[PDB]
Structure formats: C-alpha cells, structure tokens
A paper describes a structure:
Here, we show that the protein FCHSD2 is a major activator of actin polymerization during CME. FCHSD2 is recruited to endocytic pits by the scaffold protein intersectin via an unusual SH3-SH3 interaction. When bound to the membrane, FCHSD2 activates actin polymerization by a mechanism that combines oligomerization and recruitment of N-WASP to PI(4,5)P2, thus promoting pit maturation.
The fourth SH3 domain of ITSN1 (SH3d) could pull down FCHSD2 SH3-2. Isothermal titration calorimetry (ITC) revealed a 248 nM (±75 nM) affinity (Kd) with a ∼1:1 stoichiometry. SH3 domains generally bind short proline-rich sequences rather than mediate domain-domain interactions. To understand how this unusual SH3-SH3 interaction occurs, we solved the crystal structure of the FCHSD2 SH3-2/ITSN1 SH3d complex at 3.4 Å. The structure revealed tandem binding between the SH3 domains with the canonical proline-binding interface of FCHSD2 SH3-2 interacting with the surface opposite to the proline-binding interface of ITSN1 SH3d. The domains form an extensive contact surface composed largely of hydrophobic residues and a few charge interactions. Double mutants on FCHSD2 SH3-2 (Y576S+F607S or V622K+L623K) were required to abolish the interaction to ITSN1 SH3d. On the other hand, single residue mutations on ITSN1 SH3d (I1078S, I1078K, R1119A, or R1119E) could abolish the interaction with FCHSD2 SH3-2. Additionally, mutation of residues located on crystal contacts (FCHSD2 SH3-2 N613 and D583; ITSN1 SH3d T1086) did not show any effect on binding. In agreement with the interface from the crystal structure, wild-type ITSN1 SH3d could efficiently recruit FCHSD2 to the mitochondria while the interface mutant ITSN1 SH3d R1119E could not.
Numbering used by the authors:
A (entry chain D): 2 to 65
B (entry chain H), C (entry chain B), D (entry chain F): 3 to 65
E (entry chain C), F (entry chain A): 2 to 63
G (entry chain G): 6 to 59
H (entry chain E): 6 to 31, 42 to 57
Amino acid sequence: KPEIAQVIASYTATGPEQLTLAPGQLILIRKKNPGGWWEGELQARGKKRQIGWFPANYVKLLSP
Amino acid sequence: PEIAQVIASYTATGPEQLTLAPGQLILIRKKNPGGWWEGELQARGKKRQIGWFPANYVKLLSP
Amino acid sequence: PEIAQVIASYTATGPEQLTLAPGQLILIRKKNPGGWWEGELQARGKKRQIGWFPANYVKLLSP
Amino acid sequence: PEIAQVIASYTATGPEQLTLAPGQLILIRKKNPGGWWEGELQARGKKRQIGWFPANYVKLLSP
Amino acid sequence: SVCFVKALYDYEGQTDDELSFPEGAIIRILNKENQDDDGFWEGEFNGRIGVFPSVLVEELSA
Amino acid sequence: SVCFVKALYDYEGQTDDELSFPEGAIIRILNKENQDDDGFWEGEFNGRIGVFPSVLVEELSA
Amino acid sequence: VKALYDYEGQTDDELSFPEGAIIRILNKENQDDDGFWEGEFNGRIGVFPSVLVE
Amino acid sequence: VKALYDYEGQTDDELSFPEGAIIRILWEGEFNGRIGVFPSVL
C-alpha cells in the first residue's frame, strides 16, 4: 500500500502536469501507467506536497 | 568577472551541457548566437564543471 | 570475572606480550611474582588477543 | 613541509621523546645520525607536542 | 502512544538538521502537528534530534 | 538465547556507534554477531542503540 | 585550500578527501589547540590535519 | 577581500554578508564575528 520511491537522476518537468525532481528526493507513488510514466506525491522539505507525473526510469523504489 | 544566478530548473539534454538547480551560481565564459552560454558552475561539494546551457534559465548579477 | 583498565601507554617488548593504549579493557587471567600479568584484551575490531604486560600500566575495576 | 606517518607502535623510553600509535601524522623538524628524528605530532584533541623518536617506526609521504 | 514510531525503510539525511536513521528504528516524535505542511516531522533517535519525511515511518499506539 | 543484561560497571563509548551506559543499567541484547570476534555485543538502552564490551555485563537474574 | 596528499578520516566527524582537492576552510584554533582544521568538500563537512593542505 | 555582490547563505555553515564587506580569508572566511563558507566568485 504505502509505496515509496527515491529520485535516482535529475528530471526537469516538460509540462504543467509533471513534477520536477532532484536526486535524493522521496516520492509517494499514487498511479502507474503503460508509458513508463508514474504519478506521485513529492515529499520535499519546505515546499507544500505537490502531486504530479514523471518518467519512472528517473527513480528507484525502496522495499520494506 | 561576469556572474549569473540560476532562475529556473534545467536538466541537461546532452553531454556538453550543465544541469542546473535554482539558486546556483555560474561564472560565464562564452556566449553564442542561439541563446546558449558556456559557464563554470560554482556548486557546493561537486568539482567545478564547465558546460553549455540555455541563457533564459539564468539571471545576471551586476556590481 | 576480574577486569582491569589501561591507565598508561605500553608498547610490547616481546612476542609474548600485549601492546596497550590508555582506555582499553583487559580481562585478567594470571598474575605473577614479577609485577607481570597475563590478560585478554577487549579492543574494538581486532580479534581478542591474549598476552603478558607490566601490571603497573593498568588499574583494576571493582563491582 | 616534510610529513611522515606512524607505521608501528612506539612507547617513549624518555622525557625527550614522543609516544606514537599507528596511523598518527608527524611533521618532521630535525633528523640525526642515530636513526632518530625530532617531530611535531598532529594528533586529535591533545596539544601539538614536539619530541624525538626512532625513524624506523614511521613511513614518509611524498607530494 | 502519540509518542514513538517504527521506521519502515532506512533514511539518510541531506541537510545538517535532518535525522539519519536505520530501518526498524524506534523514534520519539517531538513535532507532528505542523511544520509548513511539507510532510516532514521532528524526532529523537540515538541522542540526535532532527527532521525526517513522515512517509518513512509507521505509527504505533499504546 | 537471552533478552536482557545488567551492567556491572559503567562504560563510556569511544566511537559514535558505541553504547554509553551507567552502572546497574538493564540493556536489551540485539546481536552477539561476532564482528571480527572482538568480544563486543550490541544493545539498546535509553533509546540509544550501540555496541559495548561484553565483559562489562552479566545475564540478568537474582 | 588545495590538498597536497590524500587523506582518509578515522572518526565519523573527520573529512575524507583525495589529493589536489580544493577545500573551503571553516575554522581554526580548536578549544584544545590540536592542529586540526574544519572544512567542506564534496558536500560533506568535517575536520582534517592542517599539515596536509596548501 | 571585498565583496562585489551581497550573498545570503543557504546552509547553517555558510557565510551571509552584505555588498562591499571586507572579509578575512581563512571559501574560507570571517565577517562580523561569524565564520563560514561562500562562493569565491562573489
């Protein structure tokens, strides 16, 4: 249920629907698509938790 | 000594380019017709790497 | 369970002896007429080695 | 700026001498006929003390 | 109760004031009410106090 | 094996990952995983986890 | 400061670095006069023997 | 040296300073009795 990935490589957002990610940051996963494209909620310090799409091959998952 | 500051996030589209995060400081080295500058990135910890970037992702600073 | 603590630095004068640094803990095993004890050295990382040392370089600890 | 590193443990046999533990760094000051050097010991926490030691208990480091 | 939490995955802090901890760790909560709504919380572990992403630990009552 | 031990003498840890504790302290054992068979053990006390020399404690009882 | 020889830190709070490294000095003259200085390199901050630099 | 543009430090251990400030190199440096780090380009 609580599925959580970590940013492995830098990704600047190519649209208004997408997150823009810096290596290290943690993402709570919400949806996954056919493309290789996931929706997630970004846990980054300071900024309010924003919710958007990103290419999945710029993150690594973490397992309990 | 010409020096710009990163105004917006830019991920590098090639091996010749810098990849920038807002706040960071760049020493400028060359400027081109495209809208494309070469610079040396002053970022904490990493060795000073030297590359190209779209100039409309930075703001200059004047003395 | 008799246990001393190293009070002063002692480098080993032979192959039969421990070599000690202040702070370290020694479990005591035998004591001799000389002023010379055998002990097992509890030091972090190294395997517990067992050897002789001048007793006036350690202090005992009592329960 | 000549700088050696302690290769083997040495407990001081006199008041004029340093006590050395493997790993520690010594700035070299004087070198003698005996095989005996003066140095300043850079060790964490203690004030930099300055004394003599057998040279064959250290290894130099070159730039 | 409203006091401790168990860490599900291990975390390594980025800043100076972020709380590094290993997996399974029991952490004492200090603030979980609000810190600018950025899904961080604050707590003590191993005698170091800091902040960490609240996503990474699970609750445990009583 | 055995869950708890009482500290016979007080100990002060040298490294960061060593466990400082007072005398008489009840400590929960976690590992006797011979590291390099150095005769330390691992345990929790006051919500700080670490390692300590096994020679300083005894199995708890009366 | 530029590192003349490479160093590997013993403790947790010591600064490991390679040879030639440019380090930004953070302090000097500790409470105890020990010869160690403090600085940042590669986004890790720590202390190092001042004899290894410039 | 002399600061050409004013800077504001991000971390705890970075040196905030105003424009024109004289800083004593210890980068490395003290100003107003606070020691810290700063981009040498400024």
